[PDB]
Amino acid sequence: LYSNLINVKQKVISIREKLGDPRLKSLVFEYPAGQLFRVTPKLKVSMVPKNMIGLPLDSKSNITISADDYYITDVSRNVPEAAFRTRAWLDPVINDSGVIVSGINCRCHVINDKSGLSYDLILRKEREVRV
Amino acid sequence: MTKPSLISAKILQHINSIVWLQSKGIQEPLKPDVIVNNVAYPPNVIAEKPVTNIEVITNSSMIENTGGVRQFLCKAVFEYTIVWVFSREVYKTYHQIPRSQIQDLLVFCQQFVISAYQGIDPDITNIDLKPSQVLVKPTEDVNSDVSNSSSWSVVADLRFMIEFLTSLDEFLPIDFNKIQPPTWELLDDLDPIVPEQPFTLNGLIISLNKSELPKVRADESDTYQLEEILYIPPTIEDQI
């Protein structure tokens, strides 16, 4: 069916969090304009190693940076597609208010959507991060 | 004088009445269009690039030997990059983005920074402009609309070649406070070479010689007689 398949995939994946593994990271998005959208499972993510590159703002400049990216493997399709056009945060903290203080700032760099029941995406860290 | 005061004045002239700079940082903005007076405006950022081509030539006609401390003329290239992000949600085609207004804003900043000779620093002797580059490259990873199409990014650089006067006396350990401790130790147990200190004239001693009849010679000690030893302020007697 592909409709209940994504939801059952979320239910079966929710077993992974009951086992304490350190690869699990909390991902949040800001899909609506002002407030946040959180992925339900505390999914796992790997880190592709860094590469030393020029600035993406101006490539032919003295300022250079290291591009750091994260590889998120099992992320449900139930999340809105337009969420991927908005900045994402890995391990964020929410206060008493609706804002976030600390976390690791990332932007969706490349989408892999070959599997029909889950997305898989790589997201690049911002050049300036909070923590 | 010192480049941090000059650079603070340069960024102040930049944002004075020309460019509106929402944030300062090396990163294309992912904030939504900013709503002010019920009007939406594109996000922007400014990157202040590190000062390069810092050269001291001591070979210009605009350096006066005042006789106190040696002056210098310093040349520097100060580079600023302003980036505006235009979302594809509102700007569907490339040609409807307001590139003309960006170019107008850029030329206005160039004119304002060039005219403000007396307003940036009094010791500016020359301000010149390198050819500015305007790019309509896509954003880093910023997508707007369906299909994840990259947003339009308009990047404009401003590189000011600027020549200004400096002196050794203008630099004190206060401006190095967070990078260097005052009065540190030498890395190889060497002694520090102390620069000259301004000499104050607090006494003058004159010893004149009465020369022999044919002419002054001033080499042999028998051809001149000591007359008197004069201390120009009388209080120098019994002091030194």
- Record the tokens describing residue B45, joined without a space: 């950022």
Q: What is the rounded CA–CA span in Å between residue A112 and residue A118?
A: 10
Angle among Cα A35, A37, A39 to the nearest 5 degrees reads 160
Residue A22: DSSP 8-state: T
Please give the torsion angle defined by the CA atoms of residues B65, B67, B68 and B73, in that order, rounded to the nearest 10 degrees.
10
What pairs with residue A20 in β-bridges?
A: none
- Quick check: B170 and B74 in contact, CB under 8 A? no
Residue A42: DSSP 8-state: -
Backbone conformation region of residue B67, classed left if phi is above 0, alpha if psi is from -120 to 50, else beta = left
Q: Of the candidates B176, B166, B177, which has an alpha carbon nearest to the alpha carbon of residue B55?
A: B166
Q: Between the CA of residue B196 and those of A69, B158, B171, B186, B211, what are the distances in Å?
A: 55, 40, 15, 19, 37
Which method resolved this structure? cryo-EM
Q: Of the candidates B30, B48, B76, which has an alpha carbon nearest to the alpha carbon of residue B157?
A: B48
CB contact under 8 A, B26 and A85: no
Count Cβ neighbours within 10 Å for each residue of B110-124 and write b for 16 or more, e otherwise. Answer: eebbeebeeebbebb
| CA dihedral sign of residues A101, A105, A108, A113 | negative
Q: Which residue of B has its CA nearest to A55?
A: B26
Which H or E run contains A18? Answer: none
Q: Of the candidates B99, B19, B83, which has an alpha carbon nearest to the alpha carbon of residue B45?
A: B83
Picking from B79, B81, B141, the nearest residue to A57 by CB comes out as B81
3-state secondary structure chain B: CCHHHHHHHHHHHHCCCCCCCCCECCCCCCCCCEEECCEEECCEEEEECCCEEEEECCCCCCCCCCCCCCEEEEEEEEEEEEEEEECCCCCCCHHHCCHHHHHHHHHHHHHHHHHCHHHHCCCEEEEEECCCCEECCEEEEEECCCCCCEEEEEEEEEEEEEEEEEEHHHCCCCCCCCCCCCCCCCCCCCCCCCCCCCCCCCCCEEEEEEECCCCCCCCCCCCEEEEEEEECCHHHCCCC
Please give the torsion angle defined by the CA atoms of residues B7, B9, B14 and B20, in that order, rounded to the nearest 10 degrees.
110
Q: What is the rounded CA–CA span in Å between residue A105 and residue A103?
A: 6
Angle among Cα B13, B17, B19 to the nearest 5 degrees reads 85
Which H or E run contains A10? Answer: helix A4-13
Q: What is the rounded CA–CA span in Å between residue B80 and residue B162?
A: 13
DSSP labels for A78-128? TS-GGGGGS-EEES--B-SSSSB-S-EEEEEEEEE--STTEEEEEEEEPSS
| CA dihedral sign of residues A98, A104, A109, A111 | negative
| CA dihedral sign of residues B20, B25, B28, B30 | negative
Q: Answer whether B89 touches A (CB < 8 Å).
A: no
Q: What is the rounded CA–CA span in Å between residue B155 and residue B135?
A: 5
Please give the torsion angle defined by the CA atoms of residues B135, B141, B142 and B143, in that order, rounded to the nearest 10 degrees.
110
- Quick check: A40 and A8 in contact, CB under 8 A? no
- Record the tokens describing residue B218, joined without a space: 């001033």
List, as ranges, residues 21-60 from B with C-beta within 8 Å of A.
Answer: 25-28, 30, 32, 47, 49-50, 52
What SS3 class is residue A55? coil
To the nearest whole Å, the CA of B196 is away from the closest chain A CA by 37
Q: Answer whether B12 touches A (CB < 8 Å).
A: no
- Record the tokens describing residue B144, joined without a space: 């707007």
| Angle between helix B99-115 and B3-14 (nearest 10) | 140
Residue B128 exposure: Cα atoms within 13 Å on the Cβ side: 9
To the nearest whole Å, the CA of A11 is away from the closest chain B CA by 29
Q: What is the rounded CA–CA span in Å between residue B26 and residue A127?
A: 7
What SS3 class is residue A130? coil
Q: What is the rounded CA–CA span in Å between residue B43 and residue B83?
A: 9
CB contact under 8 A, B47 and A57: yes
CB contact under 8 A, A84 and B155: no
- Record the tokens describing residue B16, joined without a space: 């004075």
Please give the torsion angle defined by the CA atoms of residues A101, A123, B46 and B86, in that order, rounded to the nearest 10 degrees.
-110
Distant-in-sequence, close-in-space partners of A125: CB < 8 Å, separation ≥ 6: A67, A68, A69, A70, A104, A105, A106
Which H or E run contains A69? Answer: strand A64-76
Q: Between the CA of residue B218 and those of B16, B204, B222, B225, what are the distances in Å?
A: 68, 21, 10, 10
Q: What is the rounded CA–CA span in Å between residue B204 and residue B233?
A: 7
Terminal Cα-to-Cα distance of chain A (whole angstroms): 42
CB contact under 8 A, B26 and A65: yes
Q: Which residue has the tokens 């991927």?
A: A84
Residues of B in contact with A128 (CB under 8 A): 25-27
Q: What is the rounded CA–CA span in Å between residue A35 and residue A29?
A: 9
Distant-in-sequence, close-in-space partners of A104: CB < 8 Å, separation ≥ 6: A89, A90, A91, A92, A125, A129, A130, A131
